[PDB]
Amino acid sequence: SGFRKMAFPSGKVEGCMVQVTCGTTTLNGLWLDDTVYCPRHVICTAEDMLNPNYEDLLIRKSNHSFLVQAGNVQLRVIGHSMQNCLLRLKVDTSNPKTPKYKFVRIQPGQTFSVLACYNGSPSGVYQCAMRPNHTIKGSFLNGSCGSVGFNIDYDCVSFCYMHHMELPTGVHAGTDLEGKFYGPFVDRQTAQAAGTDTTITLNVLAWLYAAVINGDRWFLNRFTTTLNDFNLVAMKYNYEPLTQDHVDILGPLSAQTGIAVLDMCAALKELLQNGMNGRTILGSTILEDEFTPFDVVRQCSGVTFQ
């Protein structure tokens, strides 16, 4: 029993972390096989972050303009290319610690684990969700960019996130591992701001199933709702609309507890209208939206405390 934000074990990612320096800028890269991956803004005059032209800035660099440091060993850079908002540095040594891995582009509402590093040395691991507005609520100081997010399926590390920047609200933005930003954001020092966010309804419902699986039923009710009438309420409380596909996804959790998904939505609807006051659900004073159904299945017993 218990339910905690739980991160994947970070071992296989840690063995891939290196330091990349260009000029006076130092940040982290991700050494897989013979390639290190990092934010292209490693090349940038921190004065022309204002309006960088990267193609133009990159052509001015050779191979030996970059230093890759893996522990106390220097890696020789023997090629380089820009892929969207990342650099692909070809080093002379394949990484012996290279896990089986996929690059994956994660979808809003999904979670991943973040291995925060500084100077190519890992300092901490935490969990977070891709918000609907394409930001993460991370914890990042300067020199953290190139820090990565990941999930682990079996022994296979699916990388989904590499860190580029912080926004005026103190939330975070970056790219997939092909260098494609999450959200409408760019790797220039300009006025950009997180869009309005919504609560992830799929996740809230899943976490309400988690509560029941662990043995709490206090928030349930003798009521059901149509999909559509749930959504008039969702909209008013700034929750994402529920879809039939979201209903489908909650299939197993609902089979495991015996609460029909629209029964749970009815209970959600009431939580939003009457509050919780005084009471908690899995410890929480509030309704939690950063656990997917997959995360609930992963961590709870496949047997309900009935």
Binding site: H41, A46, M49, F140, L141, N142, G143, S144, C145, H163, H164, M165, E166, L167, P168, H172, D187, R188, Q189, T190, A191, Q192
Partner: peptide, 4 residues
Amino acid sequence: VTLX
């Protein structure tokens, strides 16, 4: 913006 703050590039970290």
